[PDB]
């Protein structure tokens, strides 16, 4: 469609949402862990997002010394992906790299087109599938952070899956908006904080780019990729949409009658 232009124009103004970021305050249980997300990576992750299509990124971090309850998030890993407004499709292979062996997986963060009072069934299904496929993701350590786009700002909330949630999500095969057997008891909300005390970093695929929304046919759930230390490109970067730049008939006799003036300063 030709509607990507208005979306690109809107996404060019995502740095304005960066100023106002609201962390949801709730009835915390304070029995499990608490997670600290540095503001710089959140700012960049919002800036590279799109209002209509969700993007996702794996969370990697470590617990600081003599304080195991808190979990500092140190890295956000962007992987080849293509997103729908209600779900994000990302490959089965979890990111692996020498730089990430020291740290541990803490979950994944994804943007959301609109504010939702409850965690979407697609998110719990995806998290349960990831946990089932990979034993490295602990049931209680991993979380889901949803960064909804409120009017003029963005509110982000963390969630955790109960064992019943894992049990239901692993066997779930329905991609509908309201699957059967889904109840709020599956997930629990987890306290999280933003901080400027420390800085995080990004990791992006070594080959090509992390975004396959435009080149959808090239994305296959079984694809393999390698990571690197680099900052991600914006959603509507030129690299991400080659079908708009590459295909162009190169003129030969177009310039035969081109107007002639001398570039004196050249």
């Amino acid at each position: 469609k030709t509607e990507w232009r208005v979306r690109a124009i809107s996404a060019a103004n995502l740095h304005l949402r960066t100023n106002h970021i609201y962390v949801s305050s709730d009835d915390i249980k304070e029995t499990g862990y608490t997670y600290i997300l540095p503001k710089n990576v959140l700012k960049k992750f919002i800036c590279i997002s799109d209002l209509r299509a969700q993007i996702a990124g794996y969370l990697y971090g470590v617990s600081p010394p003599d304080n195991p309850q808190v979990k500092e998030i140190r890295c956000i890993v962007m992987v080849p992906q293509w997103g729908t407004h209600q779900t994000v499709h990302l490959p089965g292979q979890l990111p692996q790299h020498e730089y990430l062996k020291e740290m541990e997986p803490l979950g994944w963060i994804h943007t959301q087109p609109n504010e939702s009072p409850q965690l979407s069934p697609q998110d719990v299904t995806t998290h349960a599938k990831i946990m089932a496929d990979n034993p490295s993701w602990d049931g209680e350590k991993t979380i889901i952070i949803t960064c909804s786009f409120t009017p003029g700002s963005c509110t982000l909330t963390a969630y955790k899956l109960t064992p019943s949630g894992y049990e239901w999500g692993r066997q779930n095969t329905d991609k509908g908006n309201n699957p059967k057997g889904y109840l709020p008891s599956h997930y629990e909300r987890v306290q999280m904080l933003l901080s400027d005390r420390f800085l995080g970093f990004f990791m992006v695929p070594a080959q090509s780019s992390w975004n396959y929304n435009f080149m959808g046919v090239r994305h296959d759930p079984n694809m393999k990729y390698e990571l690197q230390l680099a900052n991600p490109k914006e959603f509507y970067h030129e690299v991400h949409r080659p079908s708009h730049f590459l295909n162009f008939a190169l003129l030969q006799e177009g310039e035969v009658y081109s107007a002639d003036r001398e570039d004196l300063y050249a």
Partner: protein, 1726 residues
């Protein structure tokens, strides 16, 4: 400072530009008639009769001019009339000229005559031209004319060996273009923008001639460029007093005398004006003016007008028709062909085949593939830009042979190629101007050039020209073509931009300077002549005859306009101007101030590509661009196909500009003429506009927007999106191949891995695979690797190694490739540091190292990103993450010692009465630092460390320690160490006059020689030495008892451990500590240094307690320091230096107007250059000799002592300069003048900062960067040199504060303040210079095994600093185990290196023992690498030719300086030396020292710098040669040892071995040798013992000149020896053989050897050698010094054979011809 009123410049400007006619009525020649037919009326002006030749007037034959000018005029019988008139003024006088002649009269040949004059000023000798002595600038209005000028001048001036070239290209392409060529042909805009960028700065002194071709362009909108250029040139002529000749070529138009006045042309001599009667071919111009109003009929009329005019000349004259646009050419040709064919078939004779008399050639040439195929058979043709290159030359050649009867063309034909025609018809005269945004009449210059082609010079009696135009514009062309259109100035419109350019260049500093600058503009002359035309009333003119007030008002308005747009900071009060970054960028890229304001408002860090295109579209250069109704469907269609979205409606002009630029980059096809013109205009401006945006964003440090802007600049340049395949940039690839390559979803980086077969198969076509592979490996590519080491907790030192990884091709990559080095933070949002990197073709596939400092912060970032991005290649970036995960920042350092507020200490505090007299007169009280430290230093006996900024009287603390030592013992021994020899001499004279006189204590200064040092140490009480001399002396401290028993060891400037030559100081200090450990009588150590951040480490290393460590903050200095830093953002160092000359003078005026000033410059020549520049800049100002503070008469006696002519001239004007080449007497005299106050400015080179004792008020450090030719790069000053330079600003008595101005690149500005306002951290570099000291300790048996080496390293400052800052020393941990492992690895690698070079021997794996190579390396204090080189290269057959090379390759010469332009001198020298060098690298210091050694041996004459380098080389030559002799003797080879001895004895005398022995006699030349040779004398003895009368008869000279010659023979070695074998009869095989040699000289020694051509004072050295010549074996050798008599015994083992003979050699090292040899035999028994 008048009451300025603001004038609106928009009112004053002449609208409609070049079409403004100040002419009132335009009366026309006598023959004329206006007749009307149908819708128009014609005006005819008959051709003027040529002016008859005057009396005694005749054309000049070519043979009648100077002989050198004869070449360059071949093929011409005679000069024409105009050239005949002008040849005298052009060739004989060096006077400014203005030639006003009708077009086509041969003004280019007059310009050629002026160029030949300038060339003849350099005829050199033997018919050669000094190519590098001059440059000529030829300014031409059109590029198509520039190319033809280049071609023609290359053809004409070929025989002179002179290269002419166009100036087009990138600035760094033009930088190497200009240096290559001698004649530069360029447009006014190109030359102006190059001058604005500063690219003309380097060669501006070589420009002697400037030619302003078609100078009547002043009337055009481009005229302000000419005014700026000429005014700048003339004003610079006045400013620098240099002479530049300006030649102006113009058409015959009114106000020519005003142009002559503007060009500084004398009307009586240099003004030549010729009317239309002097045109070579009479021209019967005809005008037609159409009165039709509606466009369709008016255009319909013109067709039959051209047809009717064509039919007149149908069968007899080649008609040439011009059309406005490229497409109109074919349309007009087809229209005229159809019109002539359809009616009555006029084409029959219009072609006139005459039964194919001529048509056959065109019928043969019909085999084309264009629309020219249709027209050519009928005789018509079209010539326009485009077509094909072959088609244009085909049509040109076919027209030159009178085949094409009618040729319609565009305006480029007239400018490009000289193709005259009998008749020319100008059709339309209405062109579309994209800048104006509408249809405008075409320029006057174009009309003149196009109508100057009417009539062929020799085939035409008279050629007419028809001009077709609207009747409303007929009078303008009547005026223009009949020399009645005045040349007016257009400067008012562009005044603010040119004023900003002048401010940025630094030419104008305030309003007065701007008024003076306007005084030279053509606008000023025009306002003077015609005030009423320029809005000046006659009474206003009477008010001020010189128009001072009006010029000031104009300047005030321009300054206000610039200030409003933030281009300049201008205050109305003083009228001063301050350059802003926006102003600099606008000047460099030639953009108007409104565009700069728009960019400043709109640009933001968070800008995206959409808003970037929006910002570009909102530029003010496009203010006249509007969207038209007809070009709306096409714009709408293009809107969907462009990639970047546009958030504006199509009706706005900004959206049109944006989508148009995108369509250009996307290479879309456009079908509108106006649309295509707009596209061409916007895209040609886009280069400069986007480059300016990129510079702005880069300066503000916005990384994310910087990347986008640079990529967009590259996309506009290459006309392709970055997503496309990078191989498109090589235009040789087929389009299909690249399209297929990028069709596959493919990463470009994968192509590197594949070979040529896989690349071909991968594209499903193997035949192209090899070419694709070649082009892939031609693509630029760099490999990055960083070794960063933390300096302090807030800064990191990063060295980046860039290694090219691509095959270099001259045709593709050009002379050089440019890259941008960017380091960014984690988020890639801010640029921490950036710098321009230029890769040279000759230095390709060489590793380049770039060192810079980046800051860090408390929230330690996870990593930094280092990006190296190509300047003009897409997808040519390399990124290297620099992780900080395992970085260990250095220890946090404790605060400096607090200055206790104590009452000043009286000198009477010292109880002893004798000491008080030393300081009683100097001062009554010790200053606060000395008072605070006094108790500890004077009264306590413990080690003390004093750290204070230089100039705080730290030496008095050492004096306190010395006086304390004197109290301890009546006879004491103190050793004072200073890293610099010059500082050592300064301290020596001070302490000598302080102690040896007042206290009568022995104060001595150590020299290089060892025995003299031992004697001085034995007799002296206060030892003064450098680290190297004391290291030599104290290496064998176990042998020398005097070294052990020293009471006090004072080390000064101990912060220089972190600098070069620091490891020696560290080693000697550690050795003193270790020695004091074992003596059982502690050696007190007093360490004096600058403020150290880590003074605790130094105190711990040297044993100073915490309470006796005084580390003071740099603000404790008694004289407060006012330090200012200026940043000059010029990547080119030469350009930076040249441009920063005037700022030095401005700083002198502002900070120290009447107080002494010291200027520090990097190089030796820069001293003289800067002195001359300061003199010329103050002379250009009103006040001359302001710096001289005394009458010349009293300083006259000082001049005759000087021997430098240039220095004499500068001294008379109050400015001196100091450098190494000056003799010590001259330097001390200039310093005496500076101290006395006679002169207040000295320009000292960087190296002299240590060895200079003068105090000033203001110290100016010019560049803080020097050239290292060994690495062909620039390296900044060490921070210690900067500290020493800054410390010279201390004048405690006269001054109350010390100013210091540090000028440098913009990048270093942040580092300088951080490390100059705070205490300095010092590290250790002993881990790199470890081999020599370990070798020395192994030789002296201090280190006997590996554990000894580890324990030895436990005593160093390196051991202390390894734990404090581990990552600086490549240590990955702080644990004790890590330190032990690293130390063991270091002492393992060093011992392995020594064992590999045979310096030592490692038995088993623990013990180490010295070998002979190590012993001779330690003996002569020579780097072990040099000894290894000698051992590996010397063989049994090396002769002197190889010895020179081997000596040249020693590591002692590794630091011989390499300077700019020395390659030419080295090549010229290598051409002359007796031994040539096979393919030598001229940036290699070893090649240079080989050449200098050969030149010195050949007594060749060299420049002063090369002479000083020769002195430096010869200083170490003798030690190196003695080392070579020892190596050869150890190996047992005899012939090369004798060769080395001869090499020594002939380097001393500076002669080759083949030269006559008598050459070493003083005042002897070849003629004297020639006279001596025939007489039969060949040796010095044969005249030493010869008659005085005969010797003075054969030698003709003054008695004074022969007295020293006779005395030389007295000093010449006259010795003889006797030898005997002790019990030669009782000699058995394998037994010891003792041979005794006794030599007594006869004449007594009167002094040292007489070697006038040698730097140092040599001493008689000898060699006694026993060997067998037959076997070429050196049996024994012993080196000695002979005083008056000597005895030498040589021992060896007798061989098995009973009978053996040996030849006893006796060689010298200072004299030649005194070597003796004797033959003896030994009788060996069983």
């Amino acid at each position: 400072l008048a009451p300025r009123q603001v004038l609106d410049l928009e009112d004053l400007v002449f609208t409609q530009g070049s079409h403004f006619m100040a002419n009132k009525r335009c009366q026309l020649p006598d023959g004329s008639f206006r007749r009307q037919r149908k819708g128009y009326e014609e005006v005819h002006v008959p051709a003027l009769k040529p002016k008859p030749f005057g009396s005694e007037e005749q054309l000049l034959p070519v043979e009648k001019l100077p002989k050198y000018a004869q070449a360059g005029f071949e093929g011409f019988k005679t000069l024409n009339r105009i050239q005949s008139k002008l040849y005298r003024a052009a060739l004989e006088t060096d006077e400014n000229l203005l030639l006003c002649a009708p077009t086509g009269a041969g003004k280019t040949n007059v310009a050629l005559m002026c160029m030949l004059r300038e060339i003849g000023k350099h005829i050199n000798m033997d018919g050669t031209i000094n190519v590098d002595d001059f440059k000529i600038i030829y300014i031409a209005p059109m590029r198509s004319l520039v190319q033809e000028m280049v071609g023609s001048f290359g053809k004409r001036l070929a025989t002179y060996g002179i290269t002419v070239a166009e100036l087009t290209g990138d600035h760094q392409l033009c930088k190497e273009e200009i240096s290559a060529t001698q004649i530069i042909v360029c447009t006014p805009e190109k030359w102006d923008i190059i001058t604005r960028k500063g690219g003309e700065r380097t060669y501006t002194q070589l420009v002697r001639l400037i030619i302003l071709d078609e100078i009547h362009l002043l009337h055009d909108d481009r005229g302000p460029v000419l005014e700026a250029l000429v005014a700048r040139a003339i004003r610079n002529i006045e400013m620098t007093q240099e002479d530049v000749r300006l030649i102006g070529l113009s058409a015959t138009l009114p106000n020519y005398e005003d142009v002559a006045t503007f060009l500084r042309v004398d009307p009586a001599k240099g003004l030549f004006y010729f009317d239309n009667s002097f045109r070579p071919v009479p021209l019967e111009q005809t005008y037609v003016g159409i009165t039709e109003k509606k466009a369709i009929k008016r255009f319909q009329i013109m067709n039959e007008i051209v047809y009717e005019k064509i039919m007149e000349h149908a069968g007899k004259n080649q008609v040439l028709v011009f059309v406005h646009s490229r497409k109109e050419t074919g349309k007009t040709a087809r229209a005229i062909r159809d019109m002539c064919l359809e009616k009555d078939t006029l084409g029959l004779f219009l072609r006139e085949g005459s039964a194919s008399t001529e048509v056959l050639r065109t019928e043969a040439e019909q085999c084309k593939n264009l629309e020219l195929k249709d027209l050519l058979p009928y005789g018509f043709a079209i010539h326009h830009a485009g077509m094909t290159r072959v088609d244009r030359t085909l049509v040109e050649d076919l027209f030159a042979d009178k085949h094409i009867q009618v040729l319609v063309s565009t305006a480029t034909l007239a400018w490009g190629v000289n193709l005259p025609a009998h008749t020319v018809i100008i059709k339309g005269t209405q062109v579309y101007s994209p800048e104006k945004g509408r249809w405008t009449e075409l320029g006057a210059l174009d009309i003149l050039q196009m109508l100057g082609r009417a009539g062929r010079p020799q085939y035409d009696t008279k050629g007419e020209g028809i001009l077709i135009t609207s009747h409303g514009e007929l009078q303008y062309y009547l005026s223009l073509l009949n020399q009645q259109l005045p040349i007016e100035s257009q400067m008012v419109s562009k005044l603010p931009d040119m004023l900003n350019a002048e401010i940025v260049l630094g030419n104008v500093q305030n309003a007065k300077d701007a008024v003076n600058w306007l005084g030279y503009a053509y606008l000023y002359i025009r306002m003077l002549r015609s005030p009423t035309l320029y809005g000046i009333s006659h009474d206003d003119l009477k008010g001020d005859p010189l128009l001072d007030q009006r010029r000031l008002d104009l300047v005030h308005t321009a300054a206000l306009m610039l200030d409003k747009n933030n281009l300049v900071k201008y205050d109305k009060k003083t009228g001063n101007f301050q350059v802003t970054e926006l102003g600099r960028i606008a000047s460099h890229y030639y953009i108007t101030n409104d565009t700069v304001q728009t960019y400043n408002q709109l640009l933001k860090p968070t800008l995206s590509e959409i808003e970037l295109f929006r910002v570009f579209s909102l530029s003010s250069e496009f203010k006249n661009i509007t969207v038209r109704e007809e070009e709306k469907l096409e714009l709408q269609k293009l809107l969907e196909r462009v990639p970047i979205p546009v958030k504006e409606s199509i009706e706005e002009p900004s959206a049109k500009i944006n989508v148009l630029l995108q369509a250009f980059i996307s290479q879309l096809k456009l079908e509108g003429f106006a649309l295509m013109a707009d596209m061409v205009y916007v895209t040609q401006s886009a280069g400069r506009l986007m480059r300016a945006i990129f510079e702005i964003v880069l300066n503000r440090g916005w990384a994310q927007l910087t990347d986008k802007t640079l990529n967009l600049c590259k996309m506009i340049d290459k006309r392709m999106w970055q997503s496309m395949c990078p191989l498109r940039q090589f235009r040789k690839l087929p389009e299909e191949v690249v399209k297929k390559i990028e069709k596959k979803n493919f990463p470009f980086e994968r192509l590197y891995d594949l070979n040529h077969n896989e690349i071909g198969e991968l594209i499903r076509m193997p035949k192209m695979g090899k070419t694709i592979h070649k082009y892939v490996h031609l693509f630029p590519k760099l490999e990055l690797s960083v070794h960063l080491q933390p300096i302090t907790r807030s800064t990191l030192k990063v060295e980046l190694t860039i290694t090219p990884d691509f095959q270099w091709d001259e045709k593709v990559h050009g002379s050089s490739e440019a890259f941008w080095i960017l380091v960014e933070d984690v988020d890639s949002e801010v640029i921490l540091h950036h710098e321009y990197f230029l890769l040279k073709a000759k230095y390709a596939q060489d590793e380049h190292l770039i060192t810079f400092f980046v800051p860090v912060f408390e929230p330690l970032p996870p990593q930094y990103f280092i990006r190296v991005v190509s300047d003009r290649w897409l997808s040519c970036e390399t990124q290297l993450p620099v992780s900080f995960r395992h970085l260990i920042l250095p220890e946090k350092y404790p605060p400096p010692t607090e200055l206790l507020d104590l009452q000043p200490l009286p000198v009477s505090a010292l109880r002893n009465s004798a000491f008080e007299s030393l300081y009683q007169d100097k001062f009554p009280f010790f200053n606060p630092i000395q008072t605070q430290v006094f108790n500890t230093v004077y009264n306590s006996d413990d080690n003390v460390f004093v750290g204070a900024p230089t100039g705080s009287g730290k030496t008095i603390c050492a004096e306190f320690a010395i006086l304390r030592m004197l109290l301890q013992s009546s006879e004491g021994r103190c050793v004072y160490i200073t890293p610099m020899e010059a500082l050592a001499e300064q301290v020596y004279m001070d302490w000598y006059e302080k102690f040896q006189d007042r206290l009568n204590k022995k104060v001595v200064l150590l020299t290089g020689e060892t025995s003299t040092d031992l004697k001085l140490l034995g007799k002296g009480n206060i030892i003064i030495s450098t680290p190297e001399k004391w290291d030599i002396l104290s290496r064998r401290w176990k042998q020398r008892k005097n070294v052990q028993n020293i009471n006090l060891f004072v080390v000064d400037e101990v912060h220089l451990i972190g600098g070069e030559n620091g490891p020696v100081l560290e080693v000697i200090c550690s050795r003193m500590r270790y020695i004091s450990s074992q003596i059982e009588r502690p050696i007190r150590i007093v360490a004096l240094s600058s403020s150290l951040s880590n003074a605790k480490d130094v105190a711990h290393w040297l044993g100073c307690s915490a309470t006796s460590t005084f580390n003071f903050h740099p603000n404790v200095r008694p004289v407060p320091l006012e330090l200012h830093i200026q940043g000059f953002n010029i990547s080119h160092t030469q350009t930076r230096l040249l441009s920063m000359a005037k700022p030095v003078y401005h700083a002198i005026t502002k900070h120290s107007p009447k107080k002494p000033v010291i200027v520090f410059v990097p190089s030796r020549k820069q001293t003289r250059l800067t002195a001359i520049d300061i003199l010329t800049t103050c002379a250009a100002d009103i006040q001359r000799q302001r710096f001289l503070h005394c009458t010349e008469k009293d300083l006259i006696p000082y001049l005759e002592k000087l021997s430098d002519s240039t220095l004499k001239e500068t001294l008379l004007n109050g400015v001196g300069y100091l450098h190494e080449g000056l003799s010590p007497m001259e330097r001390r005299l200039v310093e005496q003048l500076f101290s006395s106050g006679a002169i207040q400015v000295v320009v000292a080179s960087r190296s002299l900062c240590w060895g200079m004792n003068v105090a000033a008020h203001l110290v100016i450090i010019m560049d803080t960067q020097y050239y290292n030719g060994k690495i062909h790069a620039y390296v900044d000053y060490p921070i210690y040199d900067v500290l020493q330079m800054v410390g010279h600003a201390n004048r405690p008595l006269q001054d109350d504060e010390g100013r210091c101005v540090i000028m440098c690149q913009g990048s270093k500005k942040d580092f300088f303040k951080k490390f100059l306002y705070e205490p300095l951290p010092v590290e250790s570099h002993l881990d790199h210079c470890m081999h020599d000291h370990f070798n020395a300790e192994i030789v002296t048996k201090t280190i006997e095994n590996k554990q000894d080496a580890v324990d030895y390293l436990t005593w160093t400052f390196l051991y202390r600093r390894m734990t404090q800052n581990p990552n600086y020393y490549n240590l990955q941990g702080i644990s004790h185990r890590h330190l032990s492992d690293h130390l063991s690895e270091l002492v393992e690698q060093t011992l392995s290196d020594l064992e590999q070079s045979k310096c030592i021997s490692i038995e088993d794996e623990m013990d180490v023992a010295p070998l002979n190579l190590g012993m001779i390396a330690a003996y002569y204090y020579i780097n072990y690498t040099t000894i290894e080189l000698f051992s590996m290269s010397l063989n049994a057959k090396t002769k002197v030719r190889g010895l020179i090379e081997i000596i040249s390759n020693a590591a002692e010469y590794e630091n011989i300086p390499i300077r700019h332009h020395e390659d030419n001198l080295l090549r010229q020298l290598a051409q002359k030396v007796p031994h040539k060098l096979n393919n030598p690298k001229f940036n290699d210091p070893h090649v240079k020292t080989n050449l200098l050694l050969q030149a010195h041996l050949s007594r060749m004459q060299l420049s002063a710098e090369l002479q000083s380098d020769t002195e430096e080389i010869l200083s170490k030559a003798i030690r190196l040669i003695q080392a070579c002799v020892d190596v050869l003797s150890s190996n047992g080879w005899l012939s090369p040892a004798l060769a080395a001895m001869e090499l020594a004895q002939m380097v001393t005398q500076a002669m080759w071995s083949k030269d006559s022995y008598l050459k070493q006699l003083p005042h002897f030349t070849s003629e004297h040798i020639k006279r001596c040779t025939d007489k039969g004398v060949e040796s010095v003895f044969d005249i030493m013992e010869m008659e005085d009368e005969e010797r003075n008869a054969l030698l003709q000279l003054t008695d004074s000149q022969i007295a020293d010659v006779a005395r030389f023979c007295n000093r010449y070695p006259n010795i003889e020896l006797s030898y005997e074998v002790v019990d030669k009869d009782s000699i058995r095989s394998g037994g010891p053989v003792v041979v005794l040699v006794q030599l007594e000289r006869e004449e007594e020694v009167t002094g040292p050897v007489i070697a006038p051509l040698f730097p140092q004072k040599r001493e008689e050295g000898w060699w006694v050698v026993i060997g067998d010549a037959k076997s070429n074996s050196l049996i024994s050798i012993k080196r000695l010094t002979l005083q008056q008599k000597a005895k030498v015994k040589l021992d060896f083992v007798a061989p098995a054979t009973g009978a053996h003979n040996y030849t006893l050699y006796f060689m010298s090292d200072a004299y030649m011809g005194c070597d003796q040899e004797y033959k003896f035999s030994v009788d060996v028994k069983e």
